[PDB]
Write a protein that binds this DNA or RNA. Structure first.
Ligand code: VO4
Ligand code: VO4
Lengths: 531, 531
DNA sequence: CGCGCGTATAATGGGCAATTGTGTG
DNA sequence: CACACAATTGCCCATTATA
DNA sequence: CGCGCGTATAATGGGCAATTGTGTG
DNA sequence: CACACAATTGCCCATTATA
């Protein structure tokens, strides 16, 4: 292609197509495996291993991203030696042959889910048995302890609660059979190979993995040692000012047009770009709380669970702006953008979206905030700080839980660990009591001071006031609009006259000429407080 | 032994002794390995695998703790196939034969340190090369970028800064040789087996490991969902009250005696018990800051680094109470306690200490705080909360770093991850302005109200006032002392008279009789605010 | 963002011997 | 005061739980 | 407490075509 | 007003960086 490094797509299929025949072949297992590895080194090298110069090969990041891609291409395919095996275990472990055997003819997509769920259940044997190996099996304290502990270990309540009942001894010895069997099953379920043989060769390499994993580890470390202070009210204000402009007030016929609004909605809820723009689903729950579904990045739990999240302004107004944005022109292509551009588009549907919006949104954001350094996804980091500083010590929801739990749940994380990435911001001038503004107008006022004063004589007759009147009218509308030569020509004023005016109204309009056209001097102190 | 489950010690050596001959033997490698595994299953089973009932075997926790022990018994011993190998790599990679070969005849204890340091250095190639593969090797911007990047990657500055200098091309191509060689070295250094062959069999088992690792994961999770609120001033006070009692004021001829003071010192600095009691080393640095050395639990960096830590009261007074405690009787056995009790004592020197102090301190702590549930090491959790609530937004030390960095550094952790265990407490009524108290005396005052009033006629002559006078004198001393029958007999008062008095002074002394002897009604609201 | 592993300390309870506590002869 | 008997301290270790 | 791994999103820049901007014929 | 030429928008993708 044009400025491409690797013809990726072709490559990726050059193998999914090859390794689909290699397993199709009449030859058998021993050699097939021998040829699969082959295929991979074919894939592997092409991208970053052999016959590659230096400043022309892709990066470790681009390498692992592409690997994920190839690997993912086999998701729906399990190890050749799998089923053969699952059977062997049914035979080997009876009390678990209903579940084990219920797998076989099932999609891989849900075997994996059934196996980890089972592994999870089995992994709880060790502790559960230790708890019992400390409980008087007699009817003295059994009733209590049992119904307390039994109700403490869900998928066992059926065999636990059945200890102190119509039966006793025999139903007990039963468990130990579920134990000694499930305990060694796990030992085998853990060792059991699941995903397709190829995957085991489509891995980076200790060398490559280790050094990436350390690099990343370093990047987020320097990050926690470099906080960026934000001015709460300035920020909050600028956001509220976006939310007000009537939906029509701004252009939405361009991908960039919906940047301000997109970033804002994201800045108020803390949801991820994709979540806002596409698969997120909200419904009001209170003035500042809204229920959410469609958390992204979940390695399929399968479940379409809902989490109650905070909203930094009327949650109703929020759900409507999201329903708005999702409609206006710029956002209608989505049902097609997703479908991709051909058999060589390896991106995900969500990825296809990112291909469009990301470039449209980030640039706006930098201007919006002042400095460049930070991006769109900062709305999360920001939001999470606010939500914290705003509701941790107040909402009786977190009475008995620590801050980490808070960041986790508010973010949708499956462990309090990943929220270590979301703490790069510090708030300067925060008040649980902040409120927006009604308004004033530096702009028109200034242009006014030079109203009639020098407008009848600024030109031959009328002109002087007709331009000024126009410019005023035009500013009163958008107290933040940039008046250029192109802004006034559509109105029909002597071309050699407009610029003559701008050079004049230069200070009242707050514009200066840079190394090109006319611009607007910086307004206030960009939410990002300098060092 | 008496109530022991496994004769551990014997066992552990029954093998270090066996597997020391197994490698001594004239037979060779192939079979030796065959026999080592053998040895292990001998160790392994004896503790938790075969020929073991159920409620009589040890726990997964006791199992992994004991494994650590056995493993650690080989620390100073490397793989048989190691040296053989290190050589092969010197040959294989020249530019790294000085370091690789400098290993060989060296203690294992420092080879391991030399290898991870080298691995670390090599793991930085990937990124460093990518940075360069984006730098104009010409003298246009080289000087700047290079001296910026070169000074950014330490053990490379020698070969990096030497790019834009007396030389150019040849010294560059040099790096790529350090790169292509170090890059594949790592790939091999990572795969290289280091520690003794046995270790690879003295492992738990996916089944066993996975389920422990999940259990633990669960225990700390329920923990972050169960915070314990502490009353800042009550707590702080009770602590300051301990610090004041002149060193002589309390018994230190018993291990328990030094509990109050030990817990207090720990409560003021946030250091670990062992750190306080034995290997910690402090020197004042300011009113509230002190420098510390001897951080425990570090898997030898080798380095005796010092970290500046906070102190919750005069850091000078602090360092003196630590120098005090470390002396008084109860703490002098330490130089011998450490040596152990024989060849069958598998504990660590620090462990040997824990064997003594832990039981002596925890019980005091529970009474001290009110409820039982929590222990000694809570001083850390507490401290870290205070230090946070106390200095995060104030000490200009953390201007550009997030809370996690704070907890980390204040704790001595090697990663902001482990500080997720130290957040179980929440402070109720915290003020950066708290101050102790001068004093009052409910006790004596009350006993006073019943002074002469009814003392001359409380008994036959004198007695009435002589006992009361004594009891008063005795309380004025210790406004918190428990007056029992034994407290007054050494003074020589009619035995059938003391109890007659206590039954009387019962309410002024604030004592009641429980299901045994006389006790003291609870004082205030134990620092642990109820739910 | 979601999934996994071996080590170095602190904490709990048992079985005794010493000391605190009560009556009372 | 001294003696008999009830509890509670205090100890150190082998287990067991946590960072 | 300290040490390790594969995936699902968001962010950056290039090469063009369209539109904003300036002079001015 | 219409035309020539300077910049800046706006786009979507293949890379590359982050959670
Ligand atoms: O002990 V953990 O810090
Ligand atoms: O995206 V991370 O939360």
């Amino acid at each position: 292609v044009k400025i491409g490094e690797l013809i990726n797509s072709l490559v990726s299929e050059v193998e999914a197509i090859d390794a689909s025949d290699r397993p199709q072949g009449d030859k058998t297992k021993k050699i097939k495996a021998a040829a699969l590895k082959y295929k991979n080194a074919l894939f592997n090298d092409k991208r970053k291993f052999r016959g590659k110069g230096l400043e022309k090969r892709i990066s470790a990041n681009t390498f692992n991203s592409y690997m994920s891609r190839a690997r993912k291409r086999f998701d729906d395919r399990l190890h050749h030696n799998f089923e053969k095996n699952v059977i062997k275990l049914s035979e080997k472990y009876p009390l678990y042959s209903e579940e084990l055997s219920s797998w076989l003819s099932m999609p891989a997509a849900s075997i994996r889910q059934h196996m980890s769920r089972l592994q999870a259940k089995l992994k709880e044997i060790m502790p559960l048995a230790e708890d019992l190996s400390n409980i008087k099996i007699g009817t003295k304290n059994s009733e209590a302890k049992i119904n307390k502990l039994a109700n403490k270990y869900p998928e066992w309540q059926f065999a636990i609660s059945d200890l102190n009942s119509e039966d006793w001894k025999d139903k007990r010895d039963y468990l130990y059979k579920l134990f000694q069997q499930g305990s060694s099953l796990l030992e085998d379920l853990n060792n059991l190979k699941v995903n397709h043989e190829v995957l085991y060769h489509l891995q980076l390499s200790s060398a490559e993995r280790t050094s990436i994993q350390q690099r990343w580890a370093n990047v987020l470390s320097e990050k926690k040692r470099n906080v960026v202070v934000i001015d709460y009210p300035r920020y909050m204000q600028a956001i509220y000012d976006i939310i007000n402009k009537p939906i029509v007030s701004f252009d939405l016929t361009t991908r960039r047009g919906m940047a301000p609004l997109a970033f804002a909605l994201a800045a108020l809820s803390g949801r991820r770009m994709i979540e806002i723009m596409l698969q997120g689903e909200f419904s009001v729950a209170g003035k500042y709380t809204v229920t959410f579904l469609g958390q992204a990045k979940k390695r399929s739990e399968d479940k379409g669970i809902s989490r109650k999240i905070y909203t930094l302004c009327d949650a109703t107004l929020f759900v409507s702006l999201v329903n708005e944005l999702r409609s206006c022109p710029a956002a209608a292509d989505f049902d097609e953008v997703i479908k991709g551009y051909g058999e060589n588009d390896t991106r995900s549907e969500n990825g296809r979206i990112n291909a469009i919006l990301a470039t449209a949104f980030n640039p706006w954001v930098k201007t919006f905030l002042g400095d460049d350094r930070r991006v769109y996804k900062d709305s999360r980091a920001i939001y999470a700080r606010i939500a914290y500083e705003m509701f941790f010590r107040v909402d009786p929801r977190w009475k008995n839980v620590d801050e980490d739990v808070f960041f986790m749940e508010i973010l949708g994380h499956d462990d309090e660990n990943t929220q270590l990435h979301y703490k790069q911001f510090k708030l300067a001038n925060f008040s649980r009591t902040w409120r927006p503004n009604v308004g004033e107008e530096n702009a028109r006022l200034a242009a006014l001071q030079k109203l009639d004063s020098m407008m009848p004589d600024f030109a031959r007759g009328d002109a002087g006031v007709r331009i000024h009147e126009t410019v005023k009218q035009l500013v009163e509308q958008d107290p933040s609009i940039k008046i250029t030569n192109s802004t006034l020509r559509p109105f029909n004023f002597s071309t050699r006259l407009i610029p003559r005016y701008l050079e004049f109204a230069a200070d009242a309009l707050g514009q200066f000429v840079g190394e090109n056209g006319q611009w607007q001097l910086k307004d206030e102190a960009p939410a990002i407080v300098l060092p």
